[PDB]
């Protein structure tokens, strides 16, 4: 049974914690719930840690007093198809292999499933660790509670005796690096300096051996990613987001200075040996748009290349941990701003960006966002009870599962079937344009080998490669983004029409150049 | 927002509660969750109650940390 | 009304039948239930048949005393989509036409449906008899009971006056031959010598006119394919299976000598004029793995070619009726062992195997097979009744229709939705790898015309054709096998990754050779 | 067996932290957790049928007891 410790004794040294804890809704919650600090208190000084106290990062540390939120969080949505490859005719991107050739995602890119699995799914996907990690058997794939209890209770490592990234099966890749983990877990929150910079007090950084890092991590999406454990107040912990909003001064809503002021973020920094070490961003309001934008954004979390000279940008560079914090029409400029691209296309040779799930930046400027609606309104609404204490659902999932609480409460004029029909109209129209964009991208890509072999000039191939950048960006944003246009249908339509225009321009350029070579 | 009271000071006069509270699974649950004893502490001795402290009997006193049991109960 | 005959009179000549009938559970079942032998008894001698007795092969011969099993067998699963072409984006093999070009399956290859239809479906598929046979009208496609009563009660022949295989519609083929029928019916069990060899006492053989043979056959999957009618004991009748297990000494479980001994097969041969004529294999146990492997195996049942010299192997050769009885990683060696391949690819010219539904050989070595689970446990389980005499369901179908009896009885830790989710995880992952394998196969295939036309050498094209054999085998096994990886997910993953590796090797070879020609 | 085993059993979850239901009510609303976990030989309809046999027989004797008490009282 837990015995409380004297918090006033901690507060003698920990004035920042005192200021947060004594004022918020956890003022009665004793430190012993999350920390074992006996030897720490015996040996610390006002500026030196002494023995390191133990800090619980497991979600069950909160489940004792918040069982409803925990139980809602760990639910598995079985209707969210697991391990479903996007590069197939029946999923999001039928021509993905041709279009993404040259990038690690060609090895496997499945649709998302329930949050309980994020860390185990990261560890087992074919593109991440060379096939090194697997579920202990194929039955464990169902075990959401198990994954939450800890990744290593449900996974095996093919070679515990080595820590190098290598292929264990032929069609895998080793794309994982330490930055990825920041959007899967925050178990390393005390062992990682802000941005993953080298730091005397950090065990792990952008340049760590990712296999060794992986082995130290256990829990997905920790409750304290959105909730400060000391004040219980709303916050973010993700360094890339704090860097965009605060360090770069872009604000929580870059398109809306007023909303950014009303719904802002305060950076709080914690030190080690009186040097800055880690940071959090306390939110003015419980704003899920900004909480979910810790992960559901377009980012860099990988090495790449410079647009200016083609040279390598490695994990050691700050650019390997970066939130662009730009919508699709500002992205090219944001990538030029840091002089960066992701890969060269295997067939066309074009420098190309790789886009990832940009839900937050897509939502900006939409009719719902402009009306003050936020991700949680549609994806984790208040529970409705005939008799009971209301709490917030923490099962983040499609609003189709709770249409009464997620849509129909605001849209009193619709039945459930009408609301679903409105969503499907947008998704159907958007998907048709994604398919047409891929058709035109593929037609262009297929012309590159023909043009090269016919003796078309580098100058023409380079012009086509510049078009390929834009054709790719204005398409891939939408296969990466998970709403199939719902979050911003006018933007998806304008962007996909731009992709098609760019491909058609490139096809015409290449066909004319090939025909001229043949005519000579 | 609740502010914790000094439970040790209570225990200087409440040995019977001390022996139950310090030992069970509510050892970390501060008395402020269920009692308002400010004026009591100002006026009491070990042999004189002074001002009567307030004790909460409402089931919501438990529902803050035990919402699932409370919600199942009130169905 | 049936009148019993004196069996002791038959037994005077038929000592093998006596030894089986008097000892088993049909010892009280009179011969008149299945045989009309009056004139036979008047005219036979101890070694000459005399007048041939009539033998009932219809399934209603058993339905009189076993109505529950019969009625369960003939059920039509309407959720098993009928006439559903596999070569489409929404079915098993989106790029099948490109990959199988040169083979008869390109004309039509539908998904399987309920067993009642096997013989009629064989007769009407576009690749089999040139479109000669059709259902009497499009309504008869629903009539499972009708098909069971007899194929010719529900089909028409476009030209009863000729018996040649020819095209009646332009996009059909005439791939059917007498060996096919052995996995559709055993109505010919007394008219077909072991292996379909020429034999004085056999009306039909591998070299018969298949249209004439077809016309003599009526019933699908006769009850006596798995059950000896005389002893009622478990058996197989399929010659190709007996030949693999017994004649070639490979055993019922080639990877497990112990299980092969415990769950073995005894070949029993019946003679005509004191020469061997036909055979059955009595099973030591009622082992559905071996019963279902009468048909759900990879086989040859067709002419083809020799790998050594390219020469024709016709229906007259024993190789035209052959069970390889090898898993996917032993198949190439098994095909080399008989010096055989199926077709030359129409675009690449490569010698290629054609794979067919290898469920039995895929199941070997799987976690379920190694734990003593058999096909019937998942596909035809015991019926569960609140009050009643238990019997075995004979409706062979997906376990999704009876999850309580097929999975959840052994997997007490799962709900139905969890079990379904585990199946879908495997099928989704496997299908993604099948699609990627086809993508890489198609990329290779498309390079052959480019390479030929650029003047690439025969030596390089031949190296690529050798790679095409392996790329094809390691892919096609999985579009042929019906579980989409469920029966052996680790094997499917390893094989499909091998297919992709082989295609990538071939693509690289061809691209480099084309580029070198262009550079000259 | 105790009252809670039939009237406020542990909740069964595919994924989650187990807690005790505090909705004290007839086991007919949660037969999987209140009866069928101990009576593996029964379906839900069989277990309900066993309950009803007892209640039907008992209620018949209650009604007959009242008939005779009423005849005496009159
Ligand atoms: C002064 C003598 C201290 C007392 C009393 C306590 N702590 Fe402490 N702690 C102290 C220092 C100098 C540091 C390093 C960081 C800094 O502010 O300079 C810490 C660190 C912690 C941490 C972080 C540990 C990690 O893994 O990084 C925790 C969780 C922590 N301390 C908790 C804590 C608690 C619960 C105490 C009361 C029981 C406590 N500390 C006393 C200095 C001092
Ligand atoms: C019991 C000992 C607790 C543990 C362990 C945790 N929390 Fe808590 N929390 C607790 C109480 C008594 C309250 C106040 C209830 C009230 O409404 O007055 C809270 C409140 C929260 C809130 C709401 C904060 C707000 O609205 O300003 C959040 C978001 C919260 N708690 C989160 C949380 C997390 C993430 C924990 C694990 C790190 C956690 N709590 C532990 C009691 C207890
Ligand atoms: C990084 C730590 C994340 C934060 C914060 C949020 N999400 Fe998320 N989400 C994340 C990952 C890595 C995944 C995929 C997990 C996997 O194993 O595949 C997801 C998934 C979703 C989904 C899909 C759920 C399903 O049924 O398929 C939704 C609807 C979703 N995420 C929404 C969401 C919302 C609304 C958030 C703020 C409250 C949020 N996520 C935060 C990573 C992270
Ligand atoms: C936050 C900025 C993220 C970083 C850095 C990484 N990932 Fe991620 N991931 C993120 C979200 C919000 C989601 C769900 C939405 C979606 O479109 O998938 C995911 C999902 C995954 C998955 C499951 C789906 C899949 O692609 O197969 C895997 C396997 C995954 N992520 C792996 C991964 C790796 C290897 C990363 C570093 C290269 C990486 N992620 C970074 C959010 C973020
Ligand atoms: C960000 C992606 C979140 C994570 C991770 C967790 N929670 Fe949360 N929580 C979130 C939001 C947007 C809200 C609603 C705030 C609003 O005012 O609209 C909540 C709320 C809470 C509360 C308060 C009571 C309630 O409304 O339910 C508690 C006690 C709470 N959350 C606890 C909690 C726990 C235990 C978590 C880990 C399982 C958890 N939260 C994760 C956003 C996020
Ligand atoms: C209601 C007005 C919404 C707001 C605000 C947000 N999203 Fe959404 N999202 C919405 C719909 C109608 C859909 C399609 C769901 C369907 O079943 O067709 C989505 C989709 C997602 C997804 C994928 C979910 C899935 O299909 O499993 C994700 C990951 C998602 N949305 C995330 C998300 C985030 C992070 C948001 C705030 C920035 C957000 N959504 C806002 C409806 C609404
Ligand atoms: C000896 C005079 C016989 C008596 C009495 C019966 N049968 Fe016979 N039968 C006999 C011979 C020599 C043969 C040829 C096969 C052989 O063992 O050498 C047969 C064949 C049959 C068959 C197979 C017919 C076919 O189509 O191939 C059947 C089904 C059969 N016999 C049945 C049978 C029954 C039911 C009898 C009693 C009524 C019976 N036979 C008597 C020799 C003799
Ligand atoms: C009635 C006159 C029967 C006809 C016609 C058929 N069978 Fe039969 N069968 C019959 C009885 C009385 C029994 C024994 C019942 C018992 O359990 O004691 C059987 C048994 C079988 C069995 C079980 C055999 C075993 O478990 O060893 C099978 C597989 C069986 N019967 C199959 C069968 C088939 C395929 C028939 C048509 C060729 C058939 N039977 C006819 C009664 C009668
Ligand atoms: C050859 C005589 C067969 C034996 C013995 C078994 N099966 Fe079969 N099966 C066979 C064919 C020719 C077909 C396709 C029929 C058609 O008209 O398309 C099938 C089909 C199945 C299916 C699919 C059923 C559906 O609903 O789609 C299953 C699940 C199946 N077969 C399983 C099965 C099992 C478990 C067997 C041993 C008990 C078995 N089959 C024997 C040919 C033959
Ligand atoms: C046993 C070794 C078989 C031989 C010889 C033949 N077939 Fe077959 N067939 C077999 C099974 C187990 C199944 C169901 C499983 C599957 O993957 O389909 C089938 C199915 C058919 C079907 C229906 C499905 C289809 O491909 O359209 C047809 C039309 C069919 N089979 C025809 C056929 C022909 C023409 C054959 C000789 C060339 C042939 N089969 C042989 C088992 C066996
Ligand atoms: C192989 C593909 C089979 C065909 C064709 C038929 N049956 Fe069958 N039968 C089969 C199995 C695997 C079993 C179970 C054996 C075990 O012990 O697990 C059965 C069982 C019977 C029985 C016994 C009673 C029972 O368990 O139901 C009977 C009477 C029986 N089968 C009859 C029967 C009839 C009439 C068939 C044609 C419609 C029939 N079987 C086909 C395998 C196979
Ligand atoms: C349970 C452990 C199984 C055993 C043993 C066998 N099979 Fe199976 N099969 C299984 C599953 C879960 C599936 C996928 C079904 C789904 O609905 O997703 C299958 C599939 C088949 C099929 C195709 C069925 C269909 O989808 O209509 C066939 C033809 C089939 N399996 C045959 C088969 C044979 C012959 C087996 C013994 C060698 C066998 N299966 C074992 C589950 C199980
Ligand atoms: C399972 C073995 C039981 C135990 C232990 C207890 N009770 Fe029960 N109770 C049980 C049944 C099957 C029924 C009939 C319910 C029906 O729907 O037919 C009851 C009934 C009650 C009732 C009336 C409930 C109602 O019909 O709404 C009460 C108030 C009740 N039981 C209380 C109770 C108490 C206090 C127990 C412990 C002393 C107790 N029950 C034990 C099944 C079981
Ligand atoms: C007697 C009639 C009870 C009343 C009034 C309350 N609860 Fe209860 N509780 C009861 C039992 C029989 C049990 C299970 C004991 C066992 O171990 O089998 C419980 C359990 C709890 C727990 C522990 C966690 C759990 O098992 O769910 C908690 C936190 C709890 N109960 C809280 C609770 C609250 C908040 C109540 C008022 C709404 C409440 N209980 C009333 C019996 C009784
Ligand atoms: O790839 N090395 O972490
Ligand atoms: O793969 N995660 O963006
Ligand atoms: O094709 N002649 O049977
Ligand atoms: O087409 N039958 O394998
Ligand atoms: Ca999903
Ligand atoms: Ca990116
Ligand atoms: Ca089918
Ligand atoms: Ca074959």
- Full domain range(s) for residue A17: 1-58
Give the number of domains in chain A.
Answer: 3
A289 lines ligand 6 (CB under 6 A): yes
Instruction: Find, in chain A, the residue whose alpha carbon is nearest to that of C439.
Output: A97
The experimental method, as deposited, was X-ray
The answer to whether the CB of A263 falls within 8 A of the CB of A287 is yes
Residue D18 C-alpha, separation from nearest chain A C-alpha, in angstroms: 9
CA dist., res. C220 & res. C184, Å (int): 6
The answer to whether the CB of A290 falls within 8 A of the CB of A280 is no
CB atoms within 10 A of CB C3: 6
Contact assignment for B65 to A68 by CB distance below 8 Å: no
CA dist., res. C63 & res. C54, Å (int): 19
CA dist., res. A509 & res. A503, Å (int): 10
Which ligand 15 atom sits nearest the alpha carbon of residue A164?
A: 2
Q: How far is CA B68 from the centre of its chain?
A: 21
The answer to whether the CB of C36 falls within 8 A of the CB of C7 is no
- Probe target for ligand 5 pocket from A185, A223, A297, with the most ligand atoms within 8 Å of CB: A223
Residues C447 and C372 in one domain: no
CA dist., res. D11 & res. D19, Å (int): 6
Question: And the tokens for C410?
Answer: 């052994």
Chain B CB contacts of A33 below 8 Å:
28
| Helical axes C458-480 vs C489-519, angle rounded to 10° | 160
Contacting residues for A352 by C-beta, under 8 A, at least 6 apart: A102, A103, A341, A342, A343, A344, A345, A468, A469, A472
Among the listed residues C189, C283, C279, the one whose alpha carbon sits nearest the alpha carbon of residue C234: C283
Contact assignment for A85 to C435 by CB distance below 8 Å: yes
CA dist., res. A154 & res. A80, Å (int): 20
Q: How far is the CA of A293 from the centre of ligand 4 (A)?
A: 13
| Helical axes A458-480 vs A489-519, angle rounded to 10° | 160
Please calculate the CA angle A408-A413-A419 and round it to the nearest 5 degrees.
50
Q: How far is the CA of A59 from the centre of ligand 1 (A)?
A: 22
Residues A176 and A322 in one domain: yes
Instruction: Find, in chain D, the residue whose alpha carbon is nearest to that of C413.
Output: D14
Last-in-domain residue among A348, A383, A413: A413
Best residue in C384, C386, C421 for a mutation probing chain D (most D CBs within 10 Å): C386
CA dist., res. A449 & res. C507, Å (int): 13
Q: Which residue has the tokens 């009870």?
A: A385
| Three-state SS letters, C149-200 | HCHHHHEEECCCCCCCCCCCCCCCCCCCCHHHHHHCCCCCCCCECHHHCCCC
- C with A: touching (≥3 Cβ pairs within 8 Å): yes
- Cβ-count burial of B32 within 10 angstroms (0-12 exposed, 13-18 middle, 19+ buried)? middle
Instruction: Find, in chain A, the residue whose alpha carbon is nearest to that of B22.
Output: A3
Among the listed residues A372, A378, A447, the one whose alpha carbon sits nearest the alpha carbon of residue A406: A378
Residues C310 and C206 in one domain: yes
CA dist., res. A139 & res. C453, Å (int): 51
Q: Which of C386, C417, C418 sits opposite D43 (nearest CB)?
A: C386
CA dist., res. A303 & res. A103, Å (int): 12
**Is B26 within any annotated ligand binding site?**
yes
The answer to whether the CB of A77 falls within 8 A of the CB of A401 is yes
Cα-Cα-Cα-Cα dihedral sign, residues C368, C372, C375, C378 = negative
Q: How far is the CA of A185 from the centre of ligand 4 (A)?
A: 11
CA dist., res. C292 & res. C375, Å (int): 7
C53 lines ligand 7 (CB under 6 A): yes
Contacting residues for A119 by C-beta, under 8 A, at least 6 apart: A147, A151, A184, A185, A217, A218, A219, A220
Q: How far is the CA of C251 from the centre of ligand 18 (A)?
A: 24
Which residues pair with residue A85 across a beta bridge? A110
Among the listed residues A181, A217, A373, the one whose alpha carbon sits nearest the alpha carbon of residue A295: A181
Q: Which residue has the tokens 């006193």?
A: B61
Residues A232 and A269 in one domain: yes
Instruction: State whether residue A438 is helix, strand or coil.
Output: helix
Residues C347 and C389 in one domain: yes
The answer to whether the CB of C128 falls within 8 A of the CB of C182 is no
Instruction: State whether residue C454 is helix, strand or coil.
Output: helix
Task: List the CATH number of the domain containing C424.
Answer: 1.20.140.10
Q: Which residues of A251-276 are buried (b: 16+ CB within 10 A; e: fewer)?
A: bbbbebeebbeebbbeebeeebeeee
Chain B CB contacts of D22 below 8 Å:
69-70, 72-73
Residues C146 and C229 in one domain: yes
**Is B65 within any annotated ligand binding site?**
yes
Which residues pair with residue C271 across a beta bridge? C276
Residues C64 and C52 in one domain: no
CA dist., res. C214 & res. C129, Å (int): 10
User: Which chains reach chain A with 3 or more Cβ–Cβ distances below 8 angstroms?
Assistant: B, C, D
Last-in-domain residue among C381, C413, C445: C413
Nearest CA to ligand 16 atom 1: A356
Main-chain phi, psi angles of A305, to 5 degrees: -145, 160
The torsion region of residue A232 among left (phi > 0), alpha (psi -120 to 50) and beta comes to left
Which residues pair with residue A341 across a beta bridge? A305
Among the listed residues C234, C249, C352, C349, the one whose alpha carbon sits nearest the alpha carbon of residue C304: C352
The answer to whether the CB of A236 falls within 8 A of the CB of A290 is yes
| Helical axes C416-454 vs C489-519, angle rounded to 10° | 20
**Is B33 within any annotated ligand binding site?**
no
Contact assignment for B69 to D23 by CB distance below 8 Å: no
Among the listed residues C111, C119, C182, the one whose alpha carbon sits nearest the alpha carbon of residue C146: C119
Please calculate the CA angle B39-B45-B51 and round it to the nearest 5 degrees.
30
Chain C CB contacts of D43 below 8 Å:
386
Instruction: Find, in chain A, the residue whose alpha carbon is nearest to that of B73.
Output: A388
Contacting residues for C127 by C-beta, under 8 A, at least 6 apart: C104, C105, C107, C108, C109, C172, C173, C175
The answer to whether the CB of A353 falls within 8 A of the CB of A342 is yes
CA dist., res. C234 & res. A340, Å (int): 70
Interface residue ranges in chain D relative to chain C, Cβ cutoff 8 Å: 14, 43, 45-46
One-character DSSP codes across C90-140:
TSS-TTHHHHHTTSGGGG--BPP--GGGHHHHHHHSTTTSTT-EEESSGGG
Instruction: State whether residue C519 is helix, strand or coil.
Output: helix
Question: And the tokens for A437?
Answer: 């964009």
Contacting residues for C461 by C-beta, under 8 A, at least 6 apart: C349, C448, C451, C452
Nearest CA to ligand 12 atom 13: C483
**Is B31 within any annotated ligand binding site?**
yes
The answer to whether the CB of A277 falls within 8 A of the CB of A49 is no
| Helical axes A328-337 vs A489-519, angle rounded to 10° | 70
Interface residue ranges in chain A relative to chain D, Cβ cutoff 8 Å: 60, 63, 67, 70-71, 74-76, 116, 143-145, 148
Chain A CB contacts of B24 below 8 Å:
1
SS3 percent helix, strand, coil of chain A, rounded to 5, is: 45, 10, 45
Residues A389 and A459 in one domain: no
Residues with CB under 6 A from ligand 18: C 356-357
Which ligand 4 atom sits nearest the alpha carbon of residue A301?
A: 5
Question: And the tokens for A450?
Answer: 């023909």
The answer to whether the CB of A53 falls within 8 A of the CB of A35 is yes
- Cβ-count burial of A477 within 10 angstroms (0-12 exposed, 13-18 middle, 19+ buried)? buried
Residues A42 and A159 in one domain: no
CA dist., res. A216 & res. A203, Å (int): 11
Question: And the tokens for A91?
Answer: 């999923």
**Is B16 within any annotated ligand binding site?**
no
Torsion of CA A347, A348, A350, A356, to 10 degrees: -50
Q: How far is the CA of A306 from the centre of ligand 16 (A)?
A: 22
Which residues pair with residue A227 across a beta bridge? A234
Alpha helices by DSSP H, A179-327? 210-215, 239-242, 257-262, 288-292
Among the listed residues C225, C263, C233, C227, the one whose alpha carbon sits nearest the alpha carbon of residue C22: C233
CA dist., res. C206 & res. C195, Å (int): 8
Distance in angstroms between the alpha carbons of the first and the last residue of chain B: 28
- Residue A413 exposure: Cα atoms within 13 Å on the Cβ side: 1
Last-in-domain residue among C377, C395, C413: C413
Among the listed residues A354, A351, A237, the one whose alpha carbon sits nearest the alpha carbon of residue A302: A354
Residues in chain A: 520
Cα-Cα-Cα-Cα dihedral sign, residues A428, A433, A439, A442 = negative
Q: How far is the CA of C164 from the centre of ligand 17 (A)?
A: 6
Task: List the CATH number of the domain containing C14.
Answer: 1.10.287.3080
Residues C409 and C426 in one domain: no
Contacting residues for A465 by C-beta, under 8 A, at least 6 apart: A348, A349, A350, A351
CA dist., res. C68 & res. C75, Å (int): 11
Q: Which ligand is nearest to the CA of A374?
A: 6
The answer to whether the CB of A310 falls within 8 A of the CB of A227 is no
Q: How far is the CA of B57 from the centre of ligand 13 (A)?
A: 28
Nearest CA to ligand 14 atom 41: D22
Q: Which of C411, C426, C501 sits opposite A170 (nearest CB)?
A: C501
CA dist., res. A336 & res. A466, Å (int): 13
Residue D65 C-alpha, separation from nearest chain A C-alpha, in angstroms: 41
Residues A385 and A482 in one domain: no
A165 lines ligand 15 (CB under 6 A): yes
CA dist., res. A466 & res. A481, Å (int): 23
Among the listed residues A269, A296, A297, A271, the one whose alpha carbon sits nearest the alpha carbon of residue A282: A269
CA dist., res. D8 & res. B75, Å (int): 12
Q: Which residue has the tokens 């009604």?
A: D63
Contact assignment for A85 to C436 by CB distance below 8 Å: yes
Q: Which ligand is nearest to the CA of A105?
A: 4
Residues A152 and A296 in one domain: yes
Contact assignment for C428 to A81 by CB distance below 8 Å: yes
Contacting residues for A424 by C-beta, under 8 A, at least 6 apart: none
């Amino acid at each position: 049974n837990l015995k409380p410790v004297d918090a006033m004794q901690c507060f003698d040294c920990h004035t920042q914690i005192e200021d947060m804890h004594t004022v918020g809704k956890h003022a009665t919650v004793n430190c012993v719930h999350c920390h074992d600090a006996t030897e720490h208190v015996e040996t610390a000084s006002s500026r030196r840690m002494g023995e390191r106290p133990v800090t619980r990062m497991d979600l069950e540390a909160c489940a004792t007093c918040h069982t409803a939120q925990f139980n809602s969080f760990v639910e598995v949505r079985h209707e969210s198809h697991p391990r479903l490859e996007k590069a197939t005719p029946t999923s999001r991107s039928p021509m993905f292999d041709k279009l993404i050739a040259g990038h690690g995602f060609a090895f496997e890119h499945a649709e998302p499933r329930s949050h309980a699995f994020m860390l185990v799914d990261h560890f087992v996907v074919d593109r991440a660790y060379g096939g090194r990690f697997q579920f202990k058997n194929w039955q464990k794939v169902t075990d959401g509670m198990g994954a939450v209890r800890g990744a290593w209770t449900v996974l095996t490592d093919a070679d515990p005796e080595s820590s190098d990234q290598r292929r264990f099966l032929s069609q895998t890749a080793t794309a994982a690096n330490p930055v990825c983990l920041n959007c899967k877990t925050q178990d390393h929150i005390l062992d990682w300096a802000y941005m993953g910079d080298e730091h005397e007090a950090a065990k792990w950084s952008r340049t760590s051996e990712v296999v060794e890092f992986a082995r130290d991590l256990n829990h997905p999406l920790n409750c304290f990613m959105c909730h400060d454990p000391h004040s219980a107040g709303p916050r973010v912990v993700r360094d890339g987001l704090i860097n965009a909003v605060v360090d770069r001064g872009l604000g929580t809503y870059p398109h809306d200075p007023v909303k950014s002021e009303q719904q802002g973020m305060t950076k709080v920094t914690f030190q080690r040996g009186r040097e800055d070490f880690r940071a959090i961003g306390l939110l003015d309001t419980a704003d899920s748009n900004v909480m979910c934008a810790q992960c559901h954004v377009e980012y860099n979390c990988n090495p790449g290349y410079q647009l200016s000279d083609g040279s390598r940008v490695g994990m050691d560079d700050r650019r390997a941990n970066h939130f662009f914090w730009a919508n699709v029409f500002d992205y090219k400029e944001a990538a030029q701003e840091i002089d960066f691209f992701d890969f060269r296309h295997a067939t066309t040779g074009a420098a190309l960006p790789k886009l990832q799930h940009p839900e937050a930046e897509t939502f900006w400027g939409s009719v719902h966002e402009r009306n003050g609606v936020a991700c949680a309104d549609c994806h984790m609404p208040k529970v409705q009870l005939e008799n009971g204490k209301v709490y917030t659902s923490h099962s983040q999932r499609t609003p189709r599962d709770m249409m009464g609480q997620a849509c129909l409460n605001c849209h009193a004029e619709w039945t459930e079937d009408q609301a679903l029909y409105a969503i499907d109209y947008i998704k159907n129209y958007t998907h048709g344009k994604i398919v047409k964009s891929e058709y035109w991208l593929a037609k262009m890509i297929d012309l590159f080998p023909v043009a090269k072999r016919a003796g078309v000039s580098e100058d023409v191939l380079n012009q086509a490669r510049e078009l390929h950048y834009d054709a790719h960006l204005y398409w891939e944003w939408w296969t990466a983004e998970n709403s199939v246009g719902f979050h911003n249908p006018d933007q998806a339509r304008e962007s996909l029409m731009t992709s098609i225009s760019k491909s058609k321009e490139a096809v015409s350029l290449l066909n004319d150049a090939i025909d001229a070579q043949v005519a000579v």
